[PDB]
RNA sequence: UCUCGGUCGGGCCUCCUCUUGGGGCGCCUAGGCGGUGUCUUCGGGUCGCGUGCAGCCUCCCGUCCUCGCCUGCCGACAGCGCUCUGGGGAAUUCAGGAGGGGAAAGCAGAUGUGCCCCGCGGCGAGACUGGCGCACCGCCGGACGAGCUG
């Protein structure tokens, strides 16, 4: 396997922020770590001594559907460095740490955890990384942190809830700039167990267009997870930013 | 950028006053051109994108000073026809767009208030004060100035209204509370000078709510006692002084401020054979407070400051003066 | 408080703002060999792993950095190289692995197959014709 | 400068009164903001320093002073104006004396001929 | 003028500042640059010649096909232009019509045809040579860079007597006679 | 000076007035060169083993013998592309285009102040009143009103 201490190189990936570490027999995904030299979850990290302080962190795609989607090769995830990134589903903040490392010390992540102990993990990672603020409350009630979240540009969402479309609809209606960019994770077994998952995907899409989006890309993150679809869309317009 | 055009509006409205001043012998043509030029440059400076309250004050000072010069010169020319209305009105409009662009300047606000008050527009003044209070609800100074203007006019109910809304708001500092007590006792003094208020229980009441205020401190009650001790020539002044004394004795018993008010307590309306007798009484209080188990450094600092005021007042006896000097040196 | 300024008034860019300043690659000949290896990482795995044949003609990325894996605290019994296997360079690592024999074997196969009928063959014919 | 553009319309004077402090950051900054074709014809020799914003050293000044008469006449006339005006000060006078002395040394080094008439 | 906006474009449909319909796609200019002429007056003189030529062709075709004088002048125009090199065949009036062209004239000027014979690398640099004057015709030198080289003279136009160029050639090909 | 007709000119409109038996610059290769790595042939040496015979054995260095690799040059013909006031390069001048931030960026109807009076309108203490009310618990409506204010 990709055992520790191997000499690999890092090159830029076409989305900003993310880099790709390639070496020997292994190619894999990585991001500049803000808080240098300290793991998040016993993740592997990459050192480099530049002519010291700079260190990167690998992601596991099996762990984060965000990673898996990038490896599948989405077009654009809208979260350039500097972009205010709402998260939904701060499942103890692993991928949230990764996305914080993307948006950097100039960006911002506002996170939503509903469970408490996961939230303890979450606020721990927030206490480390300054650019992510946590929010622990019910994502179904964006009134609960309407005082706390300003206008963000990209909504990531990965909650496993059956009302997912109306959830993202209301949170978008309260927190998204015209020209909104969003990604959402679909577990077809969670939305509708009986149905064929592709049609499940379609129904999700049509609910989202009903809630005024425009889908523009969509793929099964297949060789990293079964029956999940990443969907990329825009709020309220066609081209991405403005 | 539309700045030229917006200036075109304001300068074109400025025109006919200048037409009239041309048509009078009050100014000559080159002066007129100087005036128009300066006005245009200032107006452009105001409607610039990046502007600042200092620039605003600069401009309005220019116009107001022009008004005064015009007045002086037409007085020298003994001409009564010209008014100041248009100048004052355009001056107002300057203040209005000033507060639209920068609402957040106490400095520019108070300049506005003072401008209105010097020209005699009290209804407008109350409106302006209203908006300023609405934009800065933590500012004791504006709260005070509004309420003090209301009390000086005499509208005691609206004075109380401003002050109660302000004490409802500004609960970090005691400052408004002392100011409201000050003007309320001043109103009681106005009633006594004109001679319920027969009781005058209201400074007791504000002291009672002060007791549960967030800033509620021993030093707070001490300054309360100070402003109460001002103008003791009253009726229930001894009543309220006894009350504040017994309350802070019950609450902060061995505080050096409690010992300080225990000293300076019987000196309510005194200047005078009643002067040195109460002096000796408070001096017995002082020696008792000094020998008592209190923070002697704090109490002595309080006492040498009060003695600094005491020696600041004149007309006393030398033996008394020197024994105060010795009791201060012994601290 | 208000002091005299300093004057300091006297091409394609150097470090990348849009990727947290990966520097432009200094091109050590070892790094060039490394990149040659990486573009050939297909033939490294002798049939045991096929990669997506990401081949430009210009095998060089204009931005790069040479790094090393730190520590997988989950796996520290085998997922880590021993000191005598912690080599300075990628090509050194692939040297220190096995199947260098197998490389040699395949190379000498192709050596034969291209020495097939080219010139020594013909000289042997003309010799055994001249005799 | 920012009002009357002294550096543009009284160039030679300001360059004159800053030349004595020719080692200092003030002088280099002024050197930056000077307009080139505006520099008086004697002082044109500071242009490579404008191209490279470092102060010139005193040997460079004295060498141009030795070659030309006009720069030396100019410095002397400036400092004479000052001391006619009773506004001189020991730093400037020391500057002027040093530069005049080294310049005259070098000038006699040039004027030596051997040939009787050219020496005369 | 900036790229005009949407509605302003829909008003300035027929407005353009460069390509005039009188400017004729700038055919004048496109050719003149491509063929290195020095006198757009010389372009238009070429042109009205080509025009007289084409109206002769058109009226010639207008003549009924069976006539002697038609046959005689078909042959005459064709073989004459062919000996002026501007054509490529000598048996097709349709080729005279939609083929005879000022561009073909320019490619039978002098510098273009010395590029074709390979005197020099690019017809610009050829113009520079013959302006300095290394380039002879027959036995004369030639300065006028519009000396229209007819086909009987392409075989002759060569280098002049005392030329550093000719001596350079002999230098490279190693026969450099100093006599 | 109200129409009308006709006319080898023009305005307007059209398709030609370019797509060259051409040139430059590239791709592509047969291959020459430089760097350089094997395999064969032997010879010298070398770590060690052995019986220190015989041998065995690691490593190196040189010859022979050919073959191969290099974003390395150059690269004939033929085929293709681009492009032609030839192709590069640097300063510098003007004419546009595309995108990133930074910017309260904010003229929907731009009327001096103060008074009183009138008109109209709001709050607004308080005082009534009509009918309705088969879960019976209260509704909803008229019209007076001190005082304040627009």
């Amino acid at each position: 396997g990709a055992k520790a201490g191997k000499k690999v190189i890092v090159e830029p990936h076409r989305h900003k922020g993310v880099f790709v570490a390639r070496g020997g027999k292994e190619d894999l995904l990585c991001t500049a770590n803000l808080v240098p030299g300290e793991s998040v979850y016993g993740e592997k990290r990459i050192s480099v001594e530049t002519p010291t302080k700079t260190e990167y962190r690998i992601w596991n795609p099996f762990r984060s559907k965000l990673a898996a989607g990038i490896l599948g090769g989405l077009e654009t995830i809208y979260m350039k460095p500097g972009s205010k990134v709402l998260y939904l589903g701060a499942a103890s903040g692993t991928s949230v740490s990764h996305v914080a490392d993307i948006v950097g010390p100039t960006g911002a992540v506002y996170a939503v955890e509903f469970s408490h102990r996961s939230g303890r993990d979450l606020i721990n990672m927030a206490t480390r990384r300054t650019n992510v603020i946590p929010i622990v409350e019910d994502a179904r009630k964006p009134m609960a942190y309407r005082m706390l979240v300003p206008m963000v540009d990209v909504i990531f969402a990965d909650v496993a809830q059956p009302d997912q479309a109306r959830i993202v609809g209301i949170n978008a209606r309260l927190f998204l700039k015209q020209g909104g960019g969003l990604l959402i994770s679909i577990k077809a077994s969670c939305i509708d167990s009986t149905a064929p998952p592709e049609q499940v995907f379609a129904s999700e899409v049509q609910k989202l267009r009903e809630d005024k989006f425009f889908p523009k890309e969509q793929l099964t993150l297949e060789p990293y997870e079964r029956d999940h679809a990443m969907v990329s869309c825009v709020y309220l317009q066609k081209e991405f930013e403005g | 950028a539309w700045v030229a055009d917006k200036a075109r509006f304001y300068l074109e409205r400025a025109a006919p006053e200048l037409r009239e001043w041309e048509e009078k012998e009050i100014f000559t043509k080159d002066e007129i051109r100087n005036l128009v030029a300066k006005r245009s440059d200032f107006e452009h400076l105001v409607l610039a994108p990046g502007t600042k309250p200092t620039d605003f004050l600069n401009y309005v000072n220019w116009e107001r000073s022009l008004d005064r010069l015009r007045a002086k010169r037409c007085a020298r020319l003994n001409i009564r026809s010209v008014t100041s209305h248009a100048s004052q009105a355009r001056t107002f409009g300057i203040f209005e767009r000033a507060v639209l662009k920068h609402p957040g300047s106490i400095e520019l606000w108070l300049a506005y208030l003072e401008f209105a008050a010097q020209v005699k527009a009290t209804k407008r003044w109350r409106r302006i004060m209203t908006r300023a209070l609405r934009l800065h609800p933590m500012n004791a100074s504006l709260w005070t100035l509004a309420g003090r203007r209301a009390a000086q006019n005499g509208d005691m109910q609206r004075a109380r209204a401003h002050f109660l809304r302000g004490c409802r708001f500004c609960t970090r500092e005691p400052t408004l509370w002392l100011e409201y007590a000050r003007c309320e006792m001043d109103w009681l003094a106005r009633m006594e000078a004109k001679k319920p208020a027969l009781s005058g229980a209201i400074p007791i009441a504000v002291f009672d709510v002060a007791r549960k205020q967030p800033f509620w401190g021993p030093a707070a009650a001490e300054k309360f006692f100070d402003v109460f001790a001002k103008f003791g020539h009253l009726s229930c002044h001894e009543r309220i002084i006894s009350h504040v004394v017994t309350t802070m004795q019950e609450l902060f018993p061995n505080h050096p401020c409690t010992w300080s008010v225990h000293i300076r307590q019987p000196l309510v309306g005194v200047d005078t054979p009643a002067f040195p007798k109460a002096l000796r009484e408070s001096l017995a209080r002082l020696k008792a407070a000094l020998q008592s188990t209190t923070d002697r450094k704090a109490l002595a600092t309080k006492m040498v400051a009060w003695m600094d005021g005491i020696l600041a007042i004149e007309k006393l006896d030398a033996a008394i003066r020197t024994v105060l000097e010795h009791t201060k040196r012994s601290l | 408080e208000l002091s005299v300024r300093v004057p300091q008034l006297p091409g394609p860019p150097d470090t990348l703002s849009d990727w947290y300043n990966i520097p432009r690659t200094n091109l050590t000949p070892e790094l060039k060999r490394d990149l040659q290896l990486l573009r050939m990482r297909d033939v490294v795995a002798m049939g045991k792993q096929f990669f997506k044949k990401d081949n430009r003609k210009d095998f060089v990325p204009e931005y790069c950095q040479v790094g090393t894996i730190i520590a997988g605290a989950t796996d520290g019994v085998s997922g880590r190289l021993t000191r005598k296997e912690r080599k300075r360079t990628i090509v050194e690592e692939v040297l220190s692995s096995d199947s260098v024999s197998k490389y040699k074997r395949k190379y000498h196969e192709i050596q034969e197959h291209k020495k097939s009928g080219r010139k020594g063959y013909y000289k042997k014919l003309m010799a055994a014709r001249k005799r | 400068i920012r009002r009357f553009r002294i550096h543009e319309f009284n160039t030679g004077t300001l360059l004159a009164t800053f030349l004595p402090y020719h080692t200092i950051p003030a002088f280099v900054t002024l050197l930056s903001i000077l307009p080139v074709q505006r520099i008086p014809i004697e002082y044109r020799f500071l242009d490579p320093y404008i191209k490279s914003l470092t102060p010139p050293p005193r040997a460079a000044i004295v060498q141009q002073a030795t070659n030309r008469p006009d720069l030396l006449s100019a410095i002397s006339r400036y400092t004479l104006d000052s001391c006619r005006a009773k506004q001189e000060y020991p730093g400037l006078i020391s500057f002027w004396g040093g530069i005049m002395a080294e310049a005259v040394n070098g000038m006699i080094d040039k004027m030596r001929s051997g040939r009787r008439a050219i020496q005369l | 003028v900036r790229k005009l906006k949407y509605h302003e474009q829909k008003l300035l449909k027929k407005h353009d500042f460069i390509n005039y319909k009188s400017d004729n796609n700038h055919r004048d200019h496109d050719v003149i640059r491509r063929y290195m002429i020095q006198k757009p007056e010389d372009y238009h003189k070429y042109n009205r010649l080509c025009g007289s030529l084409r109206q002769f062709a058109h009226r010639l075709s207008l003549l009924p096909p069976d006539n002697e004088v038609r046959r005689k002048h078909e042959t005459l125009l064709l073989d004459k232009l062919y000996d002026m090199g501007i054509l490529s065949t000598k048996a097709k009036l349709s080729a005279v019509e939609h083929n005879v062209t000022v561009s073909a004239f320019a490619r039978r000027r002098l510098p273009v045809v010395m590029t074709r014979l390979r005197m020099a690398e690019t017809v610009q640099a050829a113009t520079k040579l013959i302006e300095q004057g290394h380039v002879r015709v027959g036995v004369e030198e030639v300065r006028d860079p519009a000396f229209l080289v007819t086909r009987n003279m392409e075989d002759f136009v060569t280098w002049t007597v005392g030329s550093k160029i000719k001596q350079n050639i002999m230098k490279y090909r190693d026969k450099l006679d100093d006599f």
Side-chain angles (χ1 to χ4, degrees), chain D residues 94-101 103-106:
Chain D
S94 160
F95 179 83
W96 172 74
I99 285 309
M100 183 184 179
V104 171
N105 167 42

Side-chain angles (χ1 to χ4, degrees), chain A residues 3-10 12-19 22-25 32 42-48 50 56 81 102-104, chain C residues 16 19-20 22-23 31 35 38 41 44 51 56 61 63-74 78-81 86-90:
Chain A
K3 321 156 187 307
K6 280 279 187 44
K7 302 295 299 315
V8 312
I9 66 173
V10 282
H13 195 268
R14 187 263 334 279
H15 325 283
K16 284 139 87 175
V18 51
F19 323 113
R22 44 183 75 247
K25 68 179 53 180
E43 61 199 0
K44 306 200 177 181
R45 53 169 199 256
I46 289 163
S47 198
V48 53
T50 179
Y56 313 89
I102 275 187
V103 312
Chain C
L16 270 190
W19 276 283
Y20 304 97
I22 289 179
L31 186 61
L35 275 193
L38 262 198
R41 78 184 75 182
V44 181
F51 300 94
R56 303 131 268 197
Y63 286 112
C64 193
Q65 205 184 16
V66 169
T68 318
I69 313 291
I70 300 195
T74 81
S78 171
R80 77 286 176 275
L81 270 303
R86 283 169 186 224
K87 293 272 187 152
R88 254 88 176 186
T89 313
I90 167 169

Side-chain angles (χ1 to χ4, degrees), chain E residues 26-27 29 31-37 43 103:
Chain E
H26 298 296
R27 191 64 89 86
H29 305 151
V31 147
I32 281 180
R33 264 180 54 164
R34 181 68 94 96
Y35 269 91
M36 191 37 166
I37 332 167
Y43 176 64
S103 306

